[PDB]
Nuclear autoantigen Sp-100
Amino acid sequence: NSNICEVCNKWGRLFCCDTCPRSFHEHCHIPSVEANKNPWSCIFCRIKTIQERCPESQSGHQESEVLMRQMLPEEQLKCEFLLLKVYCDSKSCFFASEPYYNREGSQGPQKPMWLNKVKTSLNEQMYTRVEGFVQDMRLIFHNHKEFYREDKFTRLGIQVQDIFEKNFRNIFAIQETS
Ligand SMILES: [Zn+2]
Ligand SMILES: [Zn+2]
Ligand SMILES: [Zn+2]
């Protein structure tokens, strides 16, 4: 197994996947690494099994159909994995915890949102459809763009949104377009 956490790239108290070489901190894995379960398979492994059991699940889809899906177990898992793919980028630090807003010439967003809030909301089964999760995720970056205005710090929102959107298109097999 690897000697660093796949998500945050630091060593520490790591849990090792039995079916691949990845390792994780307890709360870096999503869902949090399960108490028992020997062998244990990580989220990467679980996502790979879905594709292998239904090869046609990789044929292109329309975003509008994906968003209306109900959060059954497989969609729950895919959203967890997409969330984890964001936390894998070190720039997710800026969006992880609850923000506050006090900048001359700007007003805070009407609906603040952050990664740890989305994490909790997944954990507590608060999304009934994929659309709920994706709207909250895109809201994080949209709030950041609006607040920061012409400050060059706005670019951090563009960068992490790009990671989100590439991974969304990959995980949910969105039809490729020009
Ligand atoms: Zn970690
Ligand atoms: Zn694994
Ligand atoms: Zn099949």
Observations:
- The helical segments are 43-53, 63-68, 73-87, 93-96, 115-123, 130-148, 154-171.
